[PDB]
From a paper:
To explain this observation, we determined cocrystal structures of [name] with synthetic model peptides containing the GPRGFP and GPRGLP motifs (from here on called RGF and RGL, respectively). The complexes of [name]:CMP[RGF/RGL] crystallized in space groups P3221 and I222, respectively, which both are different from those of all previously determined [name] crystal structures. The structures were refined at resolutions of 1.94 Å and 2.5 Å with refinement statistics of R/Rfree 20.3/24.8% and 21.3/26.7%. In contrast to all those RGP structures, these new ones employing the RGL and RGF collagen model peptides have only the A-site occupied by [name]. To adapt the bulky hydrophobic side chains at the X+1 position, conformational rearrangements of [name] take place. In both structures, the loop containing His274 moves slightly outward by approximately 1.8 Å (Cα – Cα distance). The results were similar to the prediction mentioned before (RGF/B and RGL/B), the phenylalanine and—less prominently—the leucine side chain clash with either the modeled second [name] molecule or the collagen backbone. Still, the presence of the leucine seems to influence the positioning of the important arginine at the B-site and might prevent binding in a similar manner.
Residue numbers in the entry:
A (entry chain C): 2 to 21
B (entry chain A): 35 to 123, 126 to 372, 374 to 411
C (entry chain D): 1 to 21
D (entry chain E): 1 to 20
Write the structure that this text describes.
């Protein structure tokens, strides 16, 4: 009977790009 | 049902609020925005009601209602104001009060007209007594909003002239309520390098929804109680300043976006709490054409006092917008694993929102949330 | 009885640009 | 009572390469 949970949090920010 | 004159002014007010939004959006000092189009148009109606010659003529031009008589503007805006009062507990509180110096007396005819057409109150304060002046203003707005708007401003900028103060409280009542326990702590990203903790409410249901993969934004329609009005939220795909979205926000583009929407299973997550925004529209209204009303040497507000004593110093637009879970109890959504893999409308970064009346399409609210509070 | 868990969250933000060469 | 929050989303994409 309990409603489904809320969506999970946002994932981690991506890794920095390679050095130019 | 609105009269055809009030309906034309409803689209006039909506267009005026659009230009107000864009004008304030360029202002790097402006953060959150909250504009009620009928209340903004009412400020120009009061200047036209209490003014003559170019001071009253400019106020009608900024409203783009030149082809209408003066008493048609006041009566039309009066019908529009009372139309929103007949749709309360969504909870909607509104107060309008003119503040003049003690050296000036209000003409009885202007007091009768402004109160009849715009529910406008009138008070005299000593602007040089800064503490007593702010208290008189802040305590009136708090009383109007029952504490939801505890203070308007912290400083009166021009100690001579008139201050038009509007205090508002709005609380959207959803057609489908959120569960009162579907709230938790989430991080709201003001920018990519700035995250403030907020309370967020979550509901998953069937909503009108469109994903614009071309211009990278989401649009969802949240109907209000008994589908008499709707709350539309526009949010870019990436965490970015809303300036790019605001260049696309037009009357034409919004309609195109509304037509591409379709009822889909959508998980909506929004910040929960009260957002307090105070605006001084006076200088922005001047940039739209209301130039003489703010000039202390040229303003003609003689209908207000009888002998040309006042000038428009400030037009305070103060609003408390509460996001809450309360709404109408909906019957089962049992014939709808429909919500098993819903589209995510995860509003943890700035978004543009507007409130639209379903019957007339008139704009009840326009604004944005760039920096909440928790 | 608590309901089932919610759906997965949104994907994280793209990474910052790399350092200069 | 409502269900627990879902799993966190996937980590974001890597950033673009830097300047030369």
């Amino acid at each position: 009977p309990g409603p489904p949970g809320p969506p999970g949090p946002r994932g981690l920010p991506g890794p920095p790009g390679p050095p130019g | 049902m609105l009269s055809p004159k009030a309906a034309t002014l409803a689209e006039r007010s909506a267009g005026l609020a659009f230009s107000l939004y864009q004008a304030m959006a360029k202002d790097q000092a402006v953060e959150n925005i909250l504009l009620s189009p009928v209340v903004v148009a009412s400020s120009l109606g009061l200047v036209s009601l209490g003014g003559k010659a170019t001071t009253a003529s400019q106020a009608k031009a900024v409203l783009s209602a030149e082809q209408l008589r003066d008493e048609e503007v006041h009566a039309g805006l009066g019908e529009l104001l009372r139309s929103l009062s007949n749709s309360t507990a969504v909870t909607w509180k509104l107060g309008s009060r003119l503040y003049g110096p003690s050296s000036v007396s209000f003409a009885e005819d202007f007091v009768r007209s402004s109160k009849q057409h715009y529910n406008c109150e009138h008070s005299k304060i000593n602007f040089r007594d800064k503490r007593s002046a702010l208290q008189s203003i802040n305590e009136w707005a708090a009383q109007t909003t029952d504490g939801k708007l505890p203070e308007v401003t912290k400083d009166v900028e021009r100690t001579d002239g008139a201050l038009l103060v509007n205090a508002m409280f709005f609380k959207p009542h959803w057609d489908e309520k959120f569960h009162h326990k579907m709230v938790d702590n989430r991080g709201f990203m003001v920018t990519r390098s700035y995250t403030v903790g907020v309370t967020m409410m979550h509901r998953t249901g069937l909503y009108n929804y469109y994903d614009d993969e071309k211009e990278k934004l989401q649009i969802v329609e949240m109907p209000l109680a008994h589908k008499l009005s709707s709350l539309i939220i526009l949010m870019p795909h990436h965490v970015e300043p809303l300036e790019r979205l605001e260049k696309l926000l037009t009357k034409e583009q919004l309609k195109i976006w509304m037509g591409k929407m379709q009822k889909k299973a959508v998980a909506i997550s929004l910040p929960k709490g009260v957002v307090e925004v105070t605006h001084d529209l006076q200088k922005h209204l001047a940039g739209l054409g209301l130039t003489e009303a703010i000039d202390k040497n040229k303003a003609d507000l003689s209908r207000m006092s009888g002998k040309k004593d006042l000038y428009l110093a400030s037009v305070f637009h103060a609003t408390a917008f509460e996001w809450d879970t309360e709404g109408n109890p909906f019957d089962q959504d049992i014939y709808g694993e429909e919500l098993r893999s819903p589209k995510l409308f995860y509003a943890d970064h700035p978004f543009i929102f507007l409130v639209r009346d379903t019957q007339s399409g008139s704009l009840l609210f326009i604004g944005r949330l760039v920096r909440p509070k928790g």
